[PDB]
Design a binder for this molecule. Sequence first.
Ligand SMILES: Nc1nc(=O)c2nc(CNc3ccc(C(=O)N[C@@H](CCC(=O)O)C(=O)O)cc3)cnc2[nH]1
Ligand SMILES: [Mn+2]
Length: 159
Amino acid sequence: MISLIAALAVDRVIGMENAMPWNLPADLAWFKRNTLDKPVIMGRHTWESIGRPLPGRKNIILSSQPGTDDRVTWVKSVDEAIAACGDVPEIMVIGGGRVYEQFLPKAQKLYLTHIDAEVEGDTHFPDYEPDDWESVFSEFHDADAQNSHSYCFEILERR
Ligand SMILES: Nc1nc(=O)c2nc(CNc3ccc(C(=O)N[C@@H](CCC(=O)O)C(=O)O)cc3)cnc2[nH]1
Ligand SMILES: [Mn+2]
């Protein structure tokens, strides 16, 4: 089953110029937790921002151009991407924006981190119709010495 994980700022802003503006240690932790051991899907842009392969997970890169790195798996389509995933309990769709757009409809569960902070960006997380989603988990966090802003981790499962 497919899951979308994503870090959202105010206004569903997800990123700016291929990078995550803010600095939130608690977010990386969580991200790493829910991703580790599962395949991860991502776009070319996201691949690039990342720089190298996420350890402990199979990297699936979705692009219309040939790969150019044999350490990761390159696929040209949403279906291909899923086949490459094999039969596993969970697939992790990590963005960018376009990607996430492609997978929402297939997605069953959403892993969201709402960040309290105004950033101007160029990308947004798709607008998903609340009505169809059920929040099964929530956890707020006041800012701190490591995390410069307050945040919320949230888990949403389709109805
Ligand atoms: N919730 C959420 N948080 C994010 O930070 C986020 N980032 C991406 C994509 N960009 C990136 C860029 C770098 C690393 C990264 O180095 N991840 C490490 C965490 C390091 C740690 O263990 O604390 C990893 O390998 O999991 C992750 C995502 C996608 N969804 C997100 N979704
Ligand atoms: Mn139900």
